[PDB]
Amino acid sequence: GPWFTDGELDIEFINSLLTIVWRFISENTFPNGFKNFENGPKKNVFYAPNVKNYSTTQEILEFITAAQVANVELTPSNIRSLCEVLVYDDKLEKVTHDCYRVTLESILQMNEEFSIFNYFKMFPASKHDKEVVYFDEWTI
Amino acid sequence: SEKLVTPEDVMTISSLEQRTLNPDLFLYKELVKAHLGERAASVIGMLVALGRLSVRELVEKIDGMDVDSVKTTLVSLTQLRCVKYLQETAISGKKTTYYYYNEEGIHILLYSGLIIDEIITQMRVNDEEEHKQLVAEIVQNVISLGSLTVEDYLSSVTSDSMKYTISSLFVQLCEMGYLIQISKLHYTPIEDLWQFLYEKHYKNIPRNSPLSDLKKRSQAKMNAKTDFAKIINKPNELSQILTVDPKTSLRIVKPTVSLTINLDRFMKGRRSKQLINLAKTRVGSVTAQVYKIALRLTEQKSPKIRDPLTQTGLLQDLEEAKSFQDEAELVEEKTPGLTFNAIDLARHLPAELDLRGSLLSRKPHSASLINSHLKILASSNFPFLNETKPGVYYVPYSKLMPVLKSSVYEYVIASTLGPSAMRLSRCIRDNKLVSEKIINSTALMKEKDIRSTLASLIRYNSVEIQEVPRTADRSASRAVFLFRCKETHSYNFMRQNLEWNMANLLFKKEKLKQENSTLLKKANRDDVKGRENELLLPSELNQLKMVNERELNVFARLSRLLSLWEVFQM
Amino acid sequence: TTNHVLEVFSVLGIEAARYSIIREINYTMSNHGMSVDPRHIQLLGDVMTYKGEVLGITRFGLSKMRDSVLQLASFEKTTDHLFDAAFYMKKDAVEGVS
Amino acid sequence: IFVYQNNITPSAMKLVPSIPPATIETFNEAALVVNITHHELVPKHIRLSSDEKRELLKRYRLKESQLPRIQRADPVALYLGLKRGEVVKIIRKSETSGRYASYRICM
Amino acid sequence: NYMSNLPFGLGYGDVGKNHITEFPSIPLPINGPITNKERSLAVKYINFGKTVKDGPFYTGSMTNDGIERYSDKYLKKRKIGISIDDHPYNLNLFPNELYNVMGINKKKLLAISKFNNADDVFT
RNA sequence: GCCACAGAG
DNA sequence: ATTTTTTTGCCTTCCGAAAATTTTG
DNA sequence: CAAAATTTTCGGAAGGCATGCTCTGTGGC
Numbered sequence A: 001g002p003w004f005t006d007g008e009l010d011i012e013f014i015n016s017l018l019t020i021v022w023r024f025i026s027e028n029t030f031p032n033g034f035k036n037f038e039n040g041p042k043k044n045v046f047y048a049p050n051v052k053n054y055s056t057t058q059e060i061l062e063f064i065t066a067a068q069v070a071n072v073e074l075t076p077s078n079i080r081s082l083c084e085v086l087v088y089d090d091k092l093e094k095v096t097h098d099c100y101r102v103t104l105e106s107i108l109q110m111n112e113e114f115s116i117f118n119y120f121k122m123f124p125a126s127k128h129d130k131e132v133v134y135f136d137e138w139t140i
Numbered sequence B: 001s002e003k004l005v006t007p008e009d010v011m012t013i014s015s016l017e018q019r020t021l022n023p024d025l026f027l028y029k030e031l032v033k034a035h036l037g038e039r040a041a042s043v044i045g046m047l048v049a050l051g052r053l054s055v056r057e058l059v060e061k062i063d064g065m066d067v068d069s070v071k072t073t074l075v076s077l078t079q080l081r082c083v084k085y086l087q088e089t090a091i092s093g094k095k096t097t098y099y100y101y102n103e104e105g106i107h108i109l110l111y112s113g114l115i116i117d118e119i120i121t122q123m124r125v126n127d128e129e130e131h132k133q134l135v136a137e138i139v140q141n142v143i144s145l146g147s148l149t150v151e152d153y154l155s156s157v158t159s160d161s162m163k164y165t166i167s168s169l170f171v172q173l174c175e176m177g178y179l180i181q182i183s184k185l186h187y188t189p190i191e192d193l194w195q196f197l198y199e200k201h202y203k204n205i206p207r208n209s210p211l212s213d214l215k216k217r218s219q220a221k222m223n224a225k226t227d228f229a230k231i232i233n234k235p236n237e238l239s240q241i242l243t244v245d246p247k248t249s250l251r252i253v254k255p256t257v258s259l260t261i262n263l264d265r266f267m268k269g270r271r272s273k274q275l276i277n278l279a280k281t282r283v284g285s286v287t288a289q290v291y292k293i294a295l296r297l298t299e300q301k302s303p304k305i306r307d308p309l310t311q312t313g314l315l316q317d318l319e320e321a322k323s324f325q326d327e328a329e330l331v332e333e334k335t336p337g338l339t340f341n342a343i344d345l346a347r348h349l350p351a352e353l354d355l356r357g358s359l360l361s362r363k364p365h366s367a368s369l370i371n372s373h374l375k376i377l378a379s380s381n382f383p384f385l386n387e388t389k390p391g392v393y394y395v396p397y398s399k400l401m402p403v404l405k406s407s408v409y410e411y412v413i414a415s416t417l418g419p420s421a422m423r424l425s426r427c428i429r430d431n432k433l434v435s436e437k438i439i440n441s442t443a444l445m446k447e448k449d450i451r452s453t454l455a456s457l458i459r460y461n462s463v464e465i466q467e468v469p470r471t472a473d474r475s476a477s478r479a480v481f482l483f484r485c486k487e488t489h490s491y492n493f494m495r496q497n498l499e500w501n502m503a504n505l506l507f508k509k510e511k512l513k514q515e516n517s518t519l520l521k522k523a524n525r526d527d528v529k530g531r532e533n534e535l536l537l538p539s540e541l542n543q544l545k546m547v548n549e550r551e552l553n554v555f556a557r558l559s560r561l562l563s564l565w566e567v568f569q570m
Numbered sequence C: 001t002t003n004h005v006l007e008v009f010s011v012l013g014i015e016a017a018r019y020s021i022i023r024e025i026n027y028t029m030s031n032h033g034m035s036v037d038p039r040h041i042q043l044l045g046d047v048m049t050y051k052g053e054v055l056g057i058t059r060f061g062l063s064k065m066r067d068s069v070l071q072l073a074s075f076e077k078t079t080d081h082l083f084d085a086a087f088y089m090k091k092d093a094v095e096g097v098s
Numbered sequence D: 001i002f003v004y005q006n007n008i009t010p011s012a013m014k015l016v017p018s019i020p021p022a023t024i025e026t027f028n029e030a031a032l033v034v035n036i037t038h039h040e041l042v043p044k045h046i047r048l049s050s051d052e053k054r055e056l057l058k059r060y061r062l063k064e065s066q067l068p069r070i071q072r073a074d075p076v077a078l079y080l081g082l083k084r085g086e087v088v089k090i091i092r093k094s095e096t097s098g099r100y101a102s103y104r105i106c107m
Numbered sequence E: 001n002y003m004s005n006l007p008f009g010l011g012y013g014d015v016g017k018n019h020i021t022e023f024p025s026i027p028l029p030i031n032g033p034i035t036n037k038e039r040s041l042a043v044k045y046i047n048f049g050k051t052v053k054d055g056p057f058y059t060g061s062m063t064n065d066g067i068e069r070y071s072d073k074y075l076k077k078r079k080i081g082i083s084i085d086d087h088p089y090n091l092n093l094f095p096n097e098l099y100n101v102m103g104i105n106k107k108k109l110l111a112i113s114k115f116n117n118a119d120d121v122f123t
Numbered sequence F: 001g002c003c004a005c006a007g008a009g
Numbered sequence G: 001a002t003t004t005t006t007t008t009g010c011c012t013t014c015c016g017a018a019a020a021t022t023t024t025g
Numbered sequence H: 001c002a003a004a005a006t007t008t009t010c011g012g013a014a015g016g017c018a019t020g021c022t023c024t025g026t027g028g029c
């Protein structure tokens, strides 16, 4: 693939390409896109279950060919592999072979009661606090 | 601490002495010592450490406590349902009572305020202050006294209308499953009960049967299984509420029955809350409200968190394991009170909920929109709902709880060790056994990042190294190391880690209260309460404020751990 | 009869094994004219045959006859005995001479 | 008392403690051709009752774990059918003194 | 020499120290600020613990001078404590060997603590 | 200091 | 990068392999 | 009845110990 730069990976190229593919899929899988989530949590809307909100591999390949930001030709295996990297990050999900759809958690990650899933909304504890809980403790 | 830290400081400011304790023993002893006294803590600790013990063995194993003190603290523990017992007679005719420890009472002590808040929330009495306060006080009295009778509770109330409202609230608690009838079932162990039933139904089969030994064992265990199910399902049949119309034709629970808190129903509610929180991150917010209404409607008749037959040691047969799986899958679906439709959910939606514009079809509590929400719930990647027939839905717990466990565990890893750790863990879990090169090819990030991240993941049993030796002696240089992800080891280790964290937090809080005991005793007086700013020094006031804030933060962090620990109890 | 002692122990019991030990040791001493008083031989036989079986005067016999740790460690296989005592957490009452 | 002829399977040796109040003793016909208690090497074993055992323990002022032990499955113990905790008095004949009494406890 | 060869990634100036920290550095996200619902939940914990601690079932830890003065008269008694054997036990829930430490045929009163909606915790 | 042999009764 | 040994006996524990026995179909 | 699981028996190898108890010298690393 084109990711091999001087014998190793080029992580900046990976991040930019994954961001633009996730951007495209999120535009397709939602009615109005991120602006639909921009105004507030309650005014947002979602597609009906019969709507084909999933994005296939060919549409993604055509979009990344038209964008010409990679500057290198892309095989469908390569775009499939990087979308597999995306679903490994739990940014999107696969509902059918060669079919993907952005999850809502990755949408909320960009921008009440405690839950583990919205951990980014939680603030770090103040210093000089004795009763603070560490995951690394009991095994250090 | 950039400078050198002496072992004095390591021992006195860190938790090194608490890292050598078993998390179960540490948590149970800390909870019992916090709520009950030190003698009960010693008894519970010895019961956890040595297993089952008689009263004589508890006397001879604990120094400084005689038979009267042991019996008194055993009575105190038994009233709060913290100790199970079994009275057995040997062949020689001697009768011995062996006392166990049961996690039910300790979890009741651990979940107490969460239980009270759940009772307050789940019967929509938040609008009415009198009903809310009465429900809170009766639940607190039930938990603090372990089990109580309605007649004894009402003997302390003099107003007739107040007595009627208390009886009505007790009936309302009983009908929705939160208060049940206590019995010797809740004090007898599950393993001993199944052993007794199996032995009885094995000796019931007469001699000289034509059928073989395996068939005899299977028949005896099937009869014991149905008898065990009938025995366990006894307190859920509302036999203690059947006393109707003594006068003026109202339904009241009997004044000669002992009611107690039901932990299984509370854990069902906690499971429903966890599933709601999981669904909030996949399918919308209005869809989450519909899922919440559907789960709260079918919460009481949902299957139990842990099937007790799995705790009888019967899982040593593969056929029994798959039979348990099949029975759970059948009972999650064909229970009459579990299936629901859009019309059933339409009668329980709140007035503020609209559903009108939440759906866009193409690129007033209507049944079609509710059905669309249930469809997008059932069509999501996570199996939130399954459709036996078009238009009817049920919650597939046996196929949803592993997904909830995996998601919670993965997001704990993502929040602690970083998102790259979550990516590596999911890459290893996707394709089961992989090498480093295959990881680098499938997961596009740097090889040294792969190695450091998996080395970090190894320490918490997240990733297990499979060594493939290529020589006669398994040298590390000549061998090749693959990586696999084992779910059970990781879940067990994370459960133990969170349990130890809860125990350490409780220990820290107890130490702080013990070292500020003088100020806390001065402040916790009837006259001083409500007049703290006048009868106390400003330094004492600041110390009291700091101590109370620290205690509040401790209990909030304990609640947040409990929201993160019960998932691995499922 | 048999000069072999464990054979007599298996056939006739421990109490005949004790006579076999005493008689065989006495015969061996008397052939060379050493003239030892047989009360010492009786004591040796009783020590070999007081735990219900013929143990034998060896490190495996002492591992079963003596429950002390320091006595067995000072005799033979010190490391194994000390590590076994540490692992099994046995309590050594200081009553022995060693 | 069960007397088999050639051999007994190991699966039946673990089935003998099946009855709680009763006990089963298995013997071999080859092992019963000659009596072992009539051998000149084997002295006189006499099992003691509970009262006699208590009297012995009171006379020597000791707990039952401090007595010399005799195993079960020992040939003489199998012959007399000693159970666990029973004390047998043994009449030894030594040429030095004459007849003297020793005691053993079944274990 | 056993102290010469190094792995390819490492360098000579990076090894030889072995300073493994004893204090953890990976916190869980539960350490955020408290909220109103969490504060009510925490004071519910505190009130329940106070109720159990002062209840009849405590079994505590394992200047009353002998001299008598006139000031001993007109002195209030501390508090008439409810003991272990002053509770209406359901005898079917207990083993028979624990009966003699309970009150089989003595005075029984059921101590009831009323829930306090107001927050007793001072800030 | 560690090994190595050499002797004495 | 061809290639000696340099006492003799006794003892327990382990660990596949094969045999013996029971247990499922 | 014979296929499959469980248990026992039987070897060869792998470990370990012993190969006195004290005492007096030298020679080389």
Ligand SMILES: CCC[C@@H](C)[C@H]1CC[C@H]2[C@@H]3[C@H](O)C[C@@H]4C[C@H](O)CC[C@]4(C)[C@H]3C[C@H](O)[C@]12C
Binding pocket: C006, C007, C010
């Ligand atoms: C080819 C030589 C085999 C030989 C070394 C085997 C075969 C016969 C075996 C003896 C018999 O089993 C009878 C006795 C059984 C006791 O338990 C231990 C001692 C005992 C005398 C045995 C010792 C040893 O085991 C023998 C002699």
